[PDB]
Amino acid sequence: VLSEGEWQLVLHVWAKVEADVAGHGQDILIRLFKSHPETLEKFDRFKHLKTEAEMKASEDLKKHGVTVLTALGAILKKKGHHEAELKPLAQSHATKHKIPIKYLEFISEAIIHVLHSRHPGDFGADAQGAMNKALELFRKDIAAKYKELGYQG
Numbered sequence: 801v802l803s804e805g806e807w808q809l810v811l812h813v814w815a816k817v818e819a820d821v822a823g824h825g826q827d828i829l830i831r832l833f834k835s836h837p838e839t840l841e842k843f844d845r846f847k848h849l850k851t852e853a854e855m856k857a858s859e860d861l862k863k864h865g866v867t868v869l870t871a872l873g874a875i876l877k878k879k880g881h882h883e884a885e886l887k888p889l890a891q892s893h894a895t896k897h898k899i900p901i902k903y904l905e906f907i908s909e910a911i912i913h914v915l916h917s918r919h920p921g922d923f924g925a926d927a928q929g930a931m932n933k934a935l936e937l938f939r940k941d942i943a944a945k946y947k948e949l950g951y952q953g
């Protein structure tokens with residue numbers, strides 16, 4: 801479990817992300833797609849995008865980035881008490897979108913990379929540690945729902 805001091809580090813930097821949800825969302829998805837090209841293939845919506853400039857130009861991609869970060873923000877602000885928010889998400893990603901747990905690991909790495917680019921002074925080691933712990937908790941709780949439904953994998 802995160803301590804109260806660790807949750808404060810997470811939510812302090814998240815308040816900055818919320819100044820520019822769309823810019824953040826875009827950078828994160830693009831990092832994910834470039835670092836792990838196999839993740840782009842999950843999105844019939846975005847499959848057609850081949851270069852980073854094309855990705856950067858796509859309004860639809862920027863719109864989905866907002867969706868992802870708004871859902872994640874609502875989970876983080878529940879500070880671990882996220883059962884009602886997490887269950888729908890784990891059900892669609894396991895059974896409808898077919899997203900392996902590993903790809904949730906990849907997008908966590910992307911989020912940490914982008915927070916680090918954009919918010920150095922608010923994202924030193926102690927905040928990066930707290931953010932990694934929060935994202936592991938998210939993954940751990942999702943993985944348990946996957947297992948229940950027969951998708952641990």
Ligand code: HEM
Pocket residue numbers: 839840842843844845867868869871872888889892893897899903904907
């Ligand atoms: C931080 C983790 C993530 C969050 C908060 C998140 C959130 C969402 C939300 C809220 C939706 C729309 C509602 C729903 O279908 O559940 C969605 C759809 C989707 N997500 Fe995720 N997602 C995450 C990670 C991923 C990753 C890593 C992949 C793919 C590698 C993925 C693939 C999809 C797909 C394919 C859709 C449907 C897109 C469309 O055709 O409209 N998601 N996600």
